[PDB]
Each structure stands twice: as C-alpha cells, then as structure tokens.
Amino acid sequence: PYFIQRLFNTCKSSLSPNGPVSEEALDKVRNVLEKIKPSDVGLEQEAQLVRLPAIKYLQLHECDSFSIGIFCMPPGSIIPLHNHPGMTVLSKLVYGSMHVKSYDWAEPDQLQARPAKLVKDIDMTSPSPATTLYPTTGGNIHCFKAITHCAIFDILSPPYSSTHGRHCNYFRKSPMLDLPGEIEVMNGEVISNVTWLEEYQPPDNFVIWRVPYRGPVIRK
Numbered sequence: 001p002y003f004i005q006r007l008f009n010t011c012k013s014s015l016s017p018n019g020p021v022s023e024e025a026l027d028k029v030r031n032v033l034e035k036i037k038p039s040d041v042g043l044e045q046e047a048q049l050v051r052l053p054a055i056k057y058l059q060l061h062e063c064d065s066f067s068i069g070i071f072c073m074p075p076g077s078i079i080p081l082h083n084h085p086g087m088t089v090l091s092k093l094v095y096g097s098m099h100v101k102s103y104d105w106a107e108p109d110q111l112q113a114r115p116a117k118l119v120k121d122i123d124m125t126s127p128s129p130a131t132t133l134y135p136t137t138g139g140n141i142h143c144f145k146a147i148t149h150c151a152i153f154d155i156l157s158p159p160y161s162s163t164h165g166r167h168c169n170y171f172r173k174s175p176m177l178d179l180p181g182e183i184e185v186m187n188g189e190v191i192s193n194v195t196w197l198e199e200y201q202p203p204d205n206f207v208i209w210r211v212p213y214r215g216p217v218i219r220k
C-alpha cells in the first residue's frame with residue numbers, strides 16, 4: 001500500500017481545482033509516479049501478457065482537484081484523438097509498448113478546421129519516463145495506439161468536467177483541402193507540417209469498459 005498511498009498523498013498536497021499549485025509541486029508528483037511498478041496498482045498479472053478490442057478504464061480516484069485512472073489496452077486498440085481543455089496531465093507507461101501522437105494548436109484560442117502543430121509521433125516502451133501535458137503545450141491533443149498489452153497511469157488536474165466546460169473533445173483531420181501545410185503566426189513564427197483538425201463525435205467502434213480497481217487500497 002506504500003506507493004499508491006504516497007502518490008495519492010502527494011497529489012492532495014500538490015494539486016488544486018485550478019491545476020498544479022506550482023511546477024515544483026508537480027515535479028514532486030512526477031518523482032513519486034516515476035517509481036511505479038505493476039504490483040503497486042495490482043497489475044502484475046496483466047503485466048506478464050506483454051508478448052475492435054475493448055479498453056479497460058480503472059478509476060482510482062476522482063475529486064475536484066484531480067483524477068487518477070489507468071487504461072489497460074490490448075494490442076492494436078486505439079484511444080482516438082482528443083484534448084484536455086485547461087488541464088495538466090501527468091502520465092506514465094506502467095508496462096508494455098504503445099504509440100503516442102500529439103499536437104498543440106498553432107495559435108491561441110479565439111466547429112471549423114483549426115491548424116495544429118505536431119509535438120510527438122513515437123513509440124514508447126517500458127520503462128519510459130513520465131510525460132506531462134499542459135493546457136497549451138506538451139501536446140494537449142493526443143491519441144494512443146497499443147503495440148503490446150500496455151497500461152497508462154494518468155493523473156489529471158483539474159479533472160474533466162462537462163458542467164465546468166472541460167469536455168473530452170475528439171478530433172479528426174479535416175477532409176477539406178486547399179489548406180496550407182505551412183503557416184506564419186504571431187511574432188513571425190513559421191510553423192511547418194501543420195495538421196488541420198476539426199471536432200467530431202468518436203466512432204461507435206470506441207468502447208471503454210469501466211472496471212473496478214483491485215490493487216492496494218487508498219485511504220482517502
């Protein structure tokens with residue numbers, strides 16, 4: 001019970017309904033989470049399978065300051081492109097390999113196609129360092145594709161909240177053409193390899209099964 005309790009404790013200290021109280025506070029969460037192993041959250045058995053399919057979501061905690069969850073992905077399964085408005089997400093591969101692709105908007109905010117720049121397009125393999133995304137940097141729009149069985153540990157602050165207007169919006173590449181691959185933004189910054197994204201409702205193909213958490217109990 002040590003690790004998950006120490007992790008939850010650091011989150012209560014470091015995270016607020018406006019987000020991480022500070023970068024130093026956030027790094028303290030990251031330092032704990034970097035030491036996670038499958039046994040700490042009860043996934044030692046799923047972790048040895050590393051060698052159209054439904055994804056499992058384990059909710060470890062939700063409150064107004066932060067959310068903690070784990071996605072267990074079977075090979076070839078996909079988390080489609082989505083964003084995290086106003087949110088910071090700390091995230092960590094527990095086991096397995098996956099492909100991540102992420103973007104950030106080319107410009108600051110003001111259902112039409114909007115230009116975004118590529119930030120990450122790479123496979124990750126355990127052990128792999130914890131990643132961080134911010135409201136406007138670090139790849140706030142991302143998608144995941146499982147190579148092996150894999151499991152992502154996710155800390156979101158603040159959590160999604162549709163009544164507070166922090167929805168999980170899904171995105172597709174715009175079919176519209178005569179859209180330029182290279183644009184110039186504020187301060188004359190040149191953005192090459194632009195991708196034009198538009199909101200869309202995720203396909204009925206996408207199934208998240210909520211599954212009860214069965215690891216070391218958290219004392220809340």
Ligand SMILES: [Fe+3]
Pocket residue numbers: 082083084142
């Ligand atoms: Fe996400």
